[PDB]
Design a protein around this ligand. Structure first.
Ligand SMILES: CC1(C)S[C@H]([C@H](NC(=O)Cc2ccccc2)C(=O)O)N[C@H]1C(=O)O
Ligand SMILES: CC1(C)S[C@H]([C@H](NC(=O)Cc2ccccc2)C(=O)O)N[C@H]1C(=O)O
Ligand SMILES: CC1(C)S[C@H]([C@H](NC(=O)Cc2ccccc2)C(=O)O)N[C@H]1C(=O)O
Ligand SMILES: CC1(C)S[C@H]([C@H](NC(=O)Cc2ccccc2)C(=O)O)N[C@H]1C(=O)O
Ligand SMILES: OC[C@H]1O[C@@](CO)(O[C@H]2O[C@H](CO)[C@@H](O)[C@H](O)[C@H]2O)[C@@H](O)[C@@H]1O
Ligand SMILES: OC[C@H]1O[C@@](CO)(O[C@H]2O[C@H](CO)[C@@H](O)[C@H](O)[C@H]2O)[C@@H](O)[C@@H]1O
Ligand SMILES: OC[C@H]1O[C@@](CO)(O[C@H]2O[C@H](CO)[C@@H](O)[C@H](O)[C@H]2O)[C@@H](O)[C@@H]1O
Ligand SMILES: OC[C@H]1O[C@@](CO)(O[C@H]2O[C@H](CO)[C@@H](O)[C@H](O)[C@H]2O)[C@@H](O)[C@@H]1O
Ligand SMILES: OC[C@H]1O[C@@](CO)(O[C@H]2O[C@H](CO)[C@@H](O)[C@H](O)[C@H]2O)[C@@H](O)[C@@H]1O
Ligand SMILES: OC[C@H]1O[C@@](CO)(O[C@H]2O[C@H](CO)[C@@H](O)[C@H](O)[C@H]2O)[C@@H](O)[C@@H]1O
Ligand SMILES: OC[C@H]1O[C@@](CO)(O[C@H]2O[C@H](CO)[C@@H](O)[C@H](O)[C@H]2O)[C@@H](O)[C@@H]1O
Ligand SMILES: OC[C@H]1O[C@@](CO)(O[C@H]2O[C@H](CO)[C@@H](O)[C@H](O)[C@H]2O)[C@@H](O)[C@@H]1O
Ligand SMILES: [Zn+2]
Ligand SMILES: [Zn+2]
Ligand SMILES: [Zn+2]
Ligand SMILES: [Zn+2]
Ligand SMILES: [Zn+2]
Ligand SMILES: [Zn+2]
Ligand SMILES: [Zn+2]
Ligand SMILES: [Zn+2]
Ligand SMILES: [Zn+2]
Ligand SMILES: [Zn+2]
Ligand SMILES: [Zn+2]
Ligand SMILES: [Zn+2]
Lengths: 266, 266, 266, 266
């Protein structure tokens, strides 16, 4: 009688899809995504690095903003990721096809990216995107260097098994600024306790809060800017209310502890 | 001002998603998909073969019908495909996870399946599904045998580069019936002439019409039953109006020639 | 003048390639590899599991011993691995082609297996084997069940990033025996300190010694039987001198500490 | 009693491993491989293309010759292949890691490259190399353009299913020269007739001879220079005795016909 349900698209708040002009974060580092999704362009003498790309439909916008910054498609050398969900790695496959970029990621992120976010530990097949391959597998603490800028990977599993914080030192008019691009610490709708697909989930989150607290962190950014209290829409004041890494980890742990207590109740 | 567009789901006619009970095609062969999408179960002494699975959301229905036929999940040994579009290979990844099945397919089908139908030559990223890996690569004319039933692959590129017809001989109360499961010969919205992503498209279709004409073909079935004039909803009369392979290829070539003439006009 | 060097084969001690008849370890568990490489067959009512396969050239021998145990190729349901080096995962690709088996492994093991052991963190391309794909990705502590026998994964990174101990409870004439198949803890020729390809190597080994100490462990086996003092060549006395998990971890840590001190010296 | 055999390395004639300085073929095109294996560097205003790399151990030599030509590792934009055997695609994985290059290849070549030449239709696992992934899948007749130089793919299956001829137009002091890099047409030790792994092998070779005859072909080069009568070791006279595409196809077909007759005899 009833047919099987139609496929449902992954739809998001309009602000996550609202294009913005490039916003300078430090001397070499620019936010080039949307008002509510981070995509960081780091420009060096020997090419550019992109950290995250946002949603699948953002590929053209990212290339447009790269061109505004003077980065031709072939000048993009490397793509790094916070984690391989559709709202952060969405356009990676298309960006690889349209640029000279390689992708570097840890093994967990590589296997999730290669299945386009399908068979997610918590989302199943509900939130997917075009698959892409990682060209370089990185280990915890490994340094990736482009044009002399060194990016250090800090694994912080929990939100995904492959969740990664990336740190690098830029300058603000020549003076060092230690940037920490810390991954999400949310657990949206997750089963936290006794999860057969992620048995050590709680232990991983708890260690990840400590990892984030200890990051070198003059300036924190996050894949969802609201998580670190950034306001990309207000330009020069965008960073004014930004959290420290310590405060971001503390807020995330308090939310996590409350969610765990509610799960025990329900 | 305007945000980027939301992602759009691949939605289809309700009849493509309308479950049906198993319909016997020959002694060992059953249609177990929906009223308007073919999924053929061939049952042998040494396990079962599935030819196509339909849409991604059909995985549970297929397993239900397998159980009605006496095929436990671990009894499914092999998945074969007509072509790797979402409406025929949709549930392959999930079926592999939930059964003991391997997938056998040609290289073109394997590479399209492995990217979940993304970066399609004609559809781009508009019609995708969870990626799956082929476990065995097959060549044109290669025979795959399960439980003594021999399935022969006949490449018929055009609708996709990897489009394949599968033939086998079943029985009807012990008497031989040469079954031809011929792939689609449609070109829905395709640019046929001077296509930079498929320069020899017209030559491939034209050869594929000839391939289909020559198939051993007592009984023709097609991924979309309407293409061969099957009527799955009427049970015992389902095959009554079915086309021959010759008539199917002729109708497809006439449609193709008309579409090519219209493309030249527009 | 001098040509580039010829490729060099991965050659091993003859005892690693010396076939042996199946040796019973417990009611359902058999050593079916060679005198000096472990390959464990666990036989259940609903099919068999293979833990490791040894060297690439052992595939036929493994299938022979499976047949002696009553396991037809299609009865092999699952392959599990200690780690994805050529002397333990060597024949996995061929076994998958010749049996109905899937492979389950963590993400690190999956990415190393998929490149056939090439670009190894320590061996480069010197020790490789035919690539294979993991069909199921498992997380730390995840339970995989076949025929009612539950196998629990315990990650113990160091020898490879994906190194895994597998535990299960068998019986000895109906009485429970907790088997621990603990991975290698060696670091043959490895740079341990300040390794840019594995920055947290020492921390991972140190945690892995503790993981092995805590395993449920009535009977310890290891990929190289000599590491746990097994003597496969003497049949019924093969397990007589076997180490406990505690003693295996202690011996490995003492060796590791000495090697680290020598590396600091040299 | 007897242990299983040791693994055997793929060893080749010394001349295949004999490094040579870059040899100019046309204004933009250089032979940069060894005396007996072709590796063509095409240098454009917008980066370089490499067609084949030879044996796995040639990676460093190729990078050295690129540097002599003024091509830094990051200037290599694209790798194209004749076919994915160890003596032509051997160093592709390492070159991708050490350069900015992507690989473009047809689906058949991509699936063979991704398993490192293992499970070869004729060689089994005897001739393998580190696996690499194709970043772009190309179709027959598709044009790939770098720095304004257009490379056209011409499929010529037989030696491998994915065998490809690549054509482009260079200049000799400004005057057009149509270069044809035609793949191997040998069948070394192959079973040609009734091959269950390649049922249409003879038909594919026969069509491939015709494909090679029709190539735009002012100057023919081949993966093994001896096949087209090149003499890389004599510098300026290297091309003097080179065959036409017509003569290369004719010689290959005569050899093929004789081998087929001998196979029928034996
Ligand atoms: C909690 C979210 C912001 S929700 C979004 C995603 N699911 C829905 O879009 C999940 O993951 N991403 C999360 C995040 O990165 O924090
Ligand atoms: C023309 C169609 C029936 S349409 C559907 C698909 N696109 C839309 O669903 C394409 O492909 N499949 C075709 C087919 O297989 O013949
Ligand atoms: C130290 C070894 C026994 S050596 C061998 C391998 N390299 C040489 O064959 C490495 O790995 N496997 C080690 C092991 O598993 O303990
Ligand atoms: C006949 C060969 C020159 S032999 C070599 C290879 N097998 C041995 O090295 C095969 O393939 N490559 C052939 C070729 O490309 O023509
Ligand atoms: O790398 C040390 C550096 O990090 C900062 C924050 O940028 O301090 C963080 O790290 C310290 C050691 O891990 C912690 O004591 C501190 O709580 C944490 O914020 C800088 O203060 C310090 O120079
Ligand atoms: O979610 C952060 C994102 O929201 C915007 C509005 O689109 O700013 C809001 O959130 C900021 C804190 O994260 C507030 O300071 C601001 O007042 C509020 O409008 C974006 O600008 C910001 O990137
Ligand atoms: O395999 C031959 C077999 O096929 C049939 C149809 O089932 O005929 C088809 O193939 C013939 C040769 O390819 C064609 O002459 C014919 O037009 C085509 O239908 C049977 O008639 C025949 O026994
Ligand atoms: O598209 C074929 C598919 O449509 C159904 C109705 O759901 O049957 C229709 O098409 C048949 C020919 O293909 C007609 O004979 C029939 O009268 C018409 O309703 C399905 O039954 C059939 O599988
Ligand atoms: O799972 C507990 C079980 O393991 C054994 C060994 O088989 O003890 C091991 O684990 C204990 C807790 O992790 C440790 O105290 C002990 O040192 C270690 O050997 C059994 O004794 C126990 O029943
Ligand atoms: O390396 C273990 C492996 O070696 C053999 C001989 O081939 O046995 C040796 O090692 C045993 C301890 O691991 C000793 O007890 C034995 O005396 C010695 O010969 C194999 O039997 C064993 O599997
Ligand atoms: O593309 C035509 C061009 O190719 C040449 C050889 O470079 O001729 C080849 O192709 C012709 C048509 O395919 C054949 O007639 C000829 O035999 C073959 O060598 C040039 O002669 C011609 O300009
Ligand atoms: O196999 C071709 C390859 O061999 C060399 C010698 O290393 O040259 C030989 O083959 C040429 C024809 O292909 C002959 O003309 C030459 O006289 C002979 O030495 C290499 O120079 C050539 O690249
Ligand atoms: Zn400045
Ligand atoms: Zn997320
Ligand atoms: Zn998110
Ligand atoms: Zn019957
Ligand atoms: Zn289709
Ligand atoms: Zn369809
Ligand atoms: Zn018993
Ligand atoms: Zn090892
Ligand atoms: Zn080992
Ligand atoms: Zn010049
Ligand atoms: Zn070859
Ligand atoms: Zn060759």
């Amino acid at each position: 009688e009833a047919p099987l349900p139609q496929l449902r698209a992954y739809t998001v708040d309009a602000s996550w899809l609202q294009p913005m002009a490039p916003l300078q974060v430090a001397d070499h580092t620019w936010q080039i995504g949307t008002e509510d999704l981070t995509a960081l362009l780091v420009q060096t003498a020997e090419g550019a690095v992109l950290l995250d790309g946002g949603m699948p439909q953002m590929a053209g916008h990212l290339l447009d903003n790269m061109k505004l910054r003077g980065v031709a498609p072939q000048d993009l050398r490397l793509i790094l990721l916070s984690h391989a969900h559709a709202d952060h790695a969405g356009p990676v496959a298309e960006l690889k096809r349209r640029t000279g970029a390689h992708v570097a990621a840890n093994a967990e992120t590589a296997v999730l990216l290669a299945r386009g976010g399908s068979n997610d530990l918590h989302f199943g097949d509900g939130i997917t995107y075009p698959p892409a391959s990682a060209d370089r597998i990185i280990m915890d603490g490994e340094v990736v260097t482009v044009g002399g800028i060194a990016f250090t990977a800090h694994f912080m599993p929990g939100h995904t098994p492959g969740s990664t914080a990336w740190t690098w030192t830029d300058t603000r008019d020549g003076k060092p600024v230690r940037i920490a691009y810390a991954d999400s610490l949310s657990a949206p709708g997750y089963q936290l306790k006794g999860n057969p697909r992620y048995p050590r989930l709680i232990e991983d989150y708890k260690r990840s809060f400590a990892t984030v607290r200890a990051l070198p962190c003059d300036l924190l950014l996050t894949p969802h800017p609201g998580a670190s209290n950034w306001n990309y829409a207000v330009g020069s004041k965008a960073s004014a209310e930004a959290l420290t890494c310590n405060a971001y980890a503390d807020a995330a742990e308090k939310k996590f502890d409350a969610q765990l207590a509610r799960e025990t109740a329900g």
